[PDB]
Amino acid sequence: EWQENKSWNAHFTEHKSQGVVVLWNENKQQGFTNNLKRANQAFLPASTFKIPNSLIALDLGVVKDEHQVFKWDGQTRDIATWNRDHNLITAMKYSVVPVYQEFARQIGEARMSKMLHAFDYGNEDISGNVDSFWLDGGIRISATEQISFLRKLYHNKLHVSERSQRIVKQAMLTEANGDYIIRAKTGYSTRIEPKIGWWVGWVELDDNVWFFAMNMDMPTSDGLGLRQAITKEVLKQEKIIP
Ligand SMILES: COc1cccc(-c2cccc(C(=O)O)c2)c1
Structure with missing residues (x-):
């Protein structure tokens, strides 16, 4: 079942923005959203696509493991952390587009399309350039569709090896303390309107897991921090995290 909670709209209209948060209680099998x-509504996945992209690259052998080094191609880009060597862990952490563009080119159109259908990922449409379709191509995914995909990943139910899914979930590690663990991926879509930010993942508790997927309008990069801050405010309100 689902339940709409418009009280959460305040968290968006307090920072003069608009968006959605979707929560899923795995134990109770109940969803909640503002x-x-x-x-x-389906948007470009932008860097949240690095989750499925990593899974495919690992399962096809394009990426051997989370330690394999992907050397900087020597082209200076405006994101300083991109102008250096990376492995799967750091490429996820700093959302290093050029590393994942190379993954996609080595994956190829046919295998990429085959895998996104097996994942039931969004509209499963890779139309556009194989090395940028998740930024300015035809692929689209909604927040509720992100949840369904993430739940499959959590339970190792995607049609790739258990190893591939375990490695990606390691690479998704974002925050951990004595109270909770967050595995998630940010996204920032700018090439097609509306410009939005994403944050999708889940919160691990001792005895339950809460999946989440949020997106919000992002007219400028100044508000990127609100992706995590708004999500955590919702989690705090629902007393999912202290
Ligand atoms: C043109 O590329 C841009 C433009 C503006 C920002 C980014 C960027 C890079 C790394 C992390 C993130 C992030 O979501 O925190 C955002 C990339």
Whole structure:
């Protein structure tokens, strides 16, 4: 079942922005959101696509393991952390597009398309350039569709090896303390309107897991921090985290 909680709209209209948060209680199998319509509106996945992209690269052998080094191609880009060597862990952490563009080129159109259908990922449409379709191509995914994909990953139910899924979930590690663990991936879509930010993942507790998927309008990069801050405010309000 689902439940709409418009009280959460304050967290967006307090920072003069608009967006949706979708929560899923795995134990109770119940969903919650501030906006049922936007929860089912499909956007470019942008860097959240590095989750499925990593899974495919690992399962096809394009990426041997999370230690394999992908050397900087020597082209200076405006993101300083991109102008250096990376492995899967750091490429995820710093959302290093050029590393994942190379993954996609080595994956190829046919295998990429085959895998996204097996994953039931979004509209499963890779139309556009194989090395940028998740930034300015035809692929689209909604917040509720992100949840369904993430739940499969959590339970090792995606049609790739258990090893591939374990490695990606390691690479998704974002925060951990004595109270909770967050595995998640940010996204920032700018090439097609509306410009949005993503944060998708889940919160591990001692005895339950809460999946989440949020997106919000992002007219400029100044508000990127609100992706995590708004999500955590919702989690705090629902007393999912202290
Ligand atoms: C043109 O590329 C841009 C433009 C503006 C920002 C980024 C960027 C890079 C790394 C992390 C993140 C992030 O979501 O925190 C954002 C990339």
